[PDB]
């Protein structure tokens, strides 16, 4: 019936965004409280009753075959997912901050000296994936596998993807081969299994999915989430992304390309891998 | 006054477009029984109003709560409701392609198959650039110039997009055109225009940052491939608001100076495209 609280006073706006209509907000209530607010997706059903029926409407501009309105419909199209923090902490303060990006071109020399240091200093934990490797987590949930320990790989579909329509088709090959870290360590050595995952991969998704390769983007990531080499295979409808087949055309065309030439992506504005390149870039 | 929409009893036909992420949808329905085209889109909120609802006792039902969190649905009044509702009647076959979802495919266009396919198939469409030698020349547009290097070889102009409005920095959306003519796109550009690339990132940078206080680290700044109209120019947008970066492009010409000549691009087209089908059957 009532909020845990009593009393709202907006301190900060957290985060926003005009397109996916969200808002996060900290406000001051009684201690700290976040409150996101969330404006839902249409029903086809419930929209198609409303126009048959009366609208209240308020026209904002009108000419010839065009005119936009103010629709106000009843209550039950006008529902807002709302999530209540409180107490709200620091942590929930900066968790949804709004990412604040700045881009980074990263020379090979970069990676060597800055970027690569500082990613073995962090000791960051990749056995879940030698469990999925190892069928000791998620074996039930794969699509496809090619078994060879150095060219081979395995195709999982997302957690989120339901499978139940391919408009958010979505999955991932993880390579069998250990040690390959990202993008950056790739050379001609792996030009078979980065061509099987493109290949393989594409006729088991058209196989089990009747999703032709026309169909979906095939790409990695740099900067990585995670530092084992791992593949996106995403439907078409669904400076970070670089697409297979360019991977291995690079490979092909200039055997070095990865660890000579320059990356560009994006990294947090208090991420501590950025402050330690702009100070060796300048 | 409370308008009532131009026609009478709407059947659904067909949903044209929709999309959860955005919270819009695009509807096909008959009326008078001509066609018709809806479109619903829920309004993003305005802090004022959320924080007022918040102080006072909004009308809420829980779905669940663990300890700390809590998740409720609102029904907020009337003010926050709004929906924004464009109406298209008497609807066209035209504008019903124009709202349906794209029904896109991947290609990828060897070095060969933009001289033997693409090129000659842009070329038979005999589509008119002169708007854009008309704001080259200061015959249109020159009040929306925000910065120029006037040199005719490695020279550009600097537009703003006509849907930015200048007031937040969150879609910064900027223009490049430049000054030199006949270069149709990227698969034109050699290393004999490596100084106009350079011009326009650095130049075009600078220019943002004395104009809108804009550091380069926010901006991404690419072109198109395919792109919209066969005159070189290059997108500057944040990065708070396919592509191919500046940057990289004048590094491979550094690097490969046949780079845009020889090697294959990928992009996507609409399944319609004759474009599309002439590209698949030369590789089939």
Redesign the interface.
């Known amino acids: 019936?009532?909020?845990?609280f009593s009393?709202?006073?907006?301190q900060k706006?957290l985060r926003?965004?005009?397109?996916?209509?969200?808002?996060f907000?900290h406000?001051k209530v009684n201690e700290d409280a976040v409150?996101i607010?969330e404006?839902?997706?249409?029903q086809?059903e419930q929209?198609?009753q409303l126009?048959?029926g009366?609208?209240?409407?308020?026209?904002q501009f009108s000419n010839d075959?065009?005119?936009?309105?103010?629709?106000?419909?009843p209550?039950q199209?006008?529902?807002?997912?709302?999530?209540?923090?409180?107490?709200?902490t620091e942590k929930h303060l900066q968790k949804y901050l709004?990412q604040d990006?700045?881009?980074?071109?990263e020379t090979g020399d970069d990676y060597r000296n800055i970027t690569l240091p500082h990613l073995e200093s962090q000791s960051l934990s990749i056995q879940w994936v030698y469990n999925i490797l190892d069928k000791k987590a998620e074996a039930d949930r794969i699509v496809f596998e090619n078994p060879d320990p150095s060219d081979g790989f395995v195709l999982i579909p997302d957690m989120k993807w339901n499978q139940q329509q391919l408009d958010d088709l979505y999955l991932i090959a993880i390579c069998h081969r250990r040690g390959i870290r990202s993008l950056r360590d790739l050379t001609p050595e792996h030009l078979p299994l980065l061509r099987n995952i493109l290949h393989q991969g594409q006729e088991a998704i058209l196989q089990r999915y009747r999703m032709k390769?026309?169909?979906?983007?095939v790409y990695l990531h740099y900067l990585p989430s995670y530092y084992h080499l791992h593949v996106h295979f995403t439907a078409?409808?669904f400076?970070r992304a670089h697409?297979l087949?360019?991977v291995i055309?690079n490979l092909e065309?200039?055997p070095r390309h990865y660890q000579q030439?320059?990356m560009?992506f994006?990294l947090r504005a208090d991420d501590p891998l950025l402050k330690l390149l702009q100070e060796a870039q300048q």
């Open positions: 019936v009532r909020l845990p009393g709202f006073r907006l706006v926003e965004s005009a397109r996916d209509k969200i808002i907000l406000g409150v607010l404006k839902t997706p249409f086809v929209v198609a126009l048959t009366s609208p209240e409407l308020q026209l075959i065009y005119s936009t309105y103010h629709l106000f419909p209550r199209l006008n529902d807002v997912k709302t999530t209540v923090v409180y107490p709200a709004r990006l700045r881009l980074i071109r390769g026309d169909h979906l983007r078409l409808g400076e697409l087949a360019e055309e065309c200039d030439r320059t560009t994006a």
